[PDB]
Amino acid sequence: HMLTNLVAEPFAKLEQDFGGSIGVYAMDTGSGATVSYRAEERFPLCSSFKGFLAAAVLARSQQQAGLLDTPIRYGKNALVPWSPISEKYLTTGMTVAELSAAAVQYSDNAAANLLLKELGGPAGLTAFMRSIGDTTFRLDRWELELNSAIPGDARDTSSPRAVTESLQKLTLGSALAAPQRQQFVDWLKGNTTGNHRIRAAVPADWAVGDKTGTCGVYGTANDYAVVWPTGRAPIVLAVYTRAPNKDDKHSEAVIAAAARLALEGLGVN
Numbered sequence: 001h002m003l004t005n006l007v008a009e010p011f012a013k014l015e016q017d018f019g020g021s022i023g024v025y026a027m028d029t030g031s032g033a034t035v036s037y038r039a040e041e042r043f044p045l046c047s048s049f050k051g052f053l054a055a056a057v058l059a060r061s062q063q064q065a066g067l068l069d070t071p072i073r074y075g076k077n078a079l080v081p082w083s084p085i086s087e088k089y090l091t092t093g094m095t096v097a098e099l100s101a102a103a104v105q106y107s108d109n110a111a112a113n114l115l116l117k118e119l120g121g122p123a124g125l126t127a128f129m130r131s132i133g134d135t136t137f138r139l140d141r142w143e144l145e146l147n148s149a150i151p152g153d154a155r156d157t158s159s160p161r162a163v164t165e166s167l168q169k170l171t172l173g174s175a176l177a178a179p180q181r182q183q184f185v186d187w188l189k190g191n192t193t194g195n196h197r198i199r200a201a202v203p204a205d206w207a208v209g210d211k212t213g214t215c216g217v218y219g220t221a222n223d224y225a226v227v228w229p230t231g232r233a234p235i236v237l238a239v240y241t242r243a244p245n246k247d248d249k250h251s252e253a254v255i256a257a258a259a260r261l262a263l264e265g266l267g268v269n
């Protein structure tokens with residue numbers, strides 16, 4: 001409770017300057033210390049649901065040994081805006097594992113919808129999150145409609161706290177079997193879209209796995225990550241933003257600054 005109080009005023013100043021709302025939850029898995037700022041409020045998931053989507057795929061692959069290497073063929077109608085990987089394999093298809101890595105590491109939208117189909121749609125991903133004890137997460141729509149980020153709309157949202165709690169269960173806890181857990185971590189470590197967010201806030205020698213989200217409207221963007229200080233227990237954190245006007249721009253610098261404040265509050269230099 002006191003760590004949250006240490007950074008309450010700096011967080012309020014950061015979000016005042018940003019012109020919107022910032023939600024942060026961070027947990028030191030070594031001490032159990034946490035820092036919260038609007039951590040239980042709902043923010044749009046945007047692209048960040050794709051990390052949990054890949055985790056749900058891995059969970060299913062624990063029972064279906066052939067799932068990850070199953071080839072998925074798709075037509076041009078499957079390609080939606082921002083499919084930088086899947087468009088290069090339109091004429092060949094890709095495996096479920098390749099689609100998952102593309103959804104995580106490039107935010108590939110065609111890949112994300114194809115995987116959602118394999119899981120039974122937004123309700124199927126929501127069901128997976130319930131199965132690990134997350135009662136907050138909800139996915140309701142497909143790409144790209146899920147990015148509307150409408151103020152007050154609970155569709156396709158979660159809270160920073162629930163995002164962090166579910167991330168910890170999947171990457172460090174027992175929600176996935178050990179081989180699948182390491183694959184999820186490896187996919188997150190290989191993300192290419194987050195160099196200016198949580199990654200910009202940590203020392204160069206720390207290992208980081210993250211998944212970003214960018215709705216493109218309402219100043220709504222986010223990032224969640226597991227970070228490993230060298231020789232120390234990992235930290236799990238989530239930073240989500242939104243703003244009142246549709247034309248309001250998101251800020252990667254604000255996300256990185258919020259991550260820095262969270263780590264400062266936890267006392268990790």
Ligand SMILES: C=C1CS[C@H]([C@H](NC(=O)/C(=N\OC)c2csc(N)n2)C(=O)O)N=C1C(=O)O
Nearest residue numbers: 081082143144145146147148149215216217246
């Ligand atoms: C934030 C969203 C959610 S997706 C929705 C939709 N738009 C598209 O699916 C789209 N092109 O559709 C011609 C698109 C999304 S990203 C890109 N490069 N293109 C719609 O027109 O209703 N609208 C918005 C919004 O911007 O307000």
Ligand SMILES: C=C1CS[C@H]([C@H](NC(=O)/C(=N\OC)c2csc(N)n2)C(=O)O)N=C1C(=O)O
Nearest residue numbers: 047082107109144147193212213214215216217
């Ligand atoms: C950094 C990226 C790459 S672009 C990807 C994508 N988002 C959009 O193309 C988008 N605005 O991007 C400025 C959008 C969607 S609807 C609308 N009106 N705008 C996605 O939704 O996956 N996401 C992220 C990420 O942070 O992972």
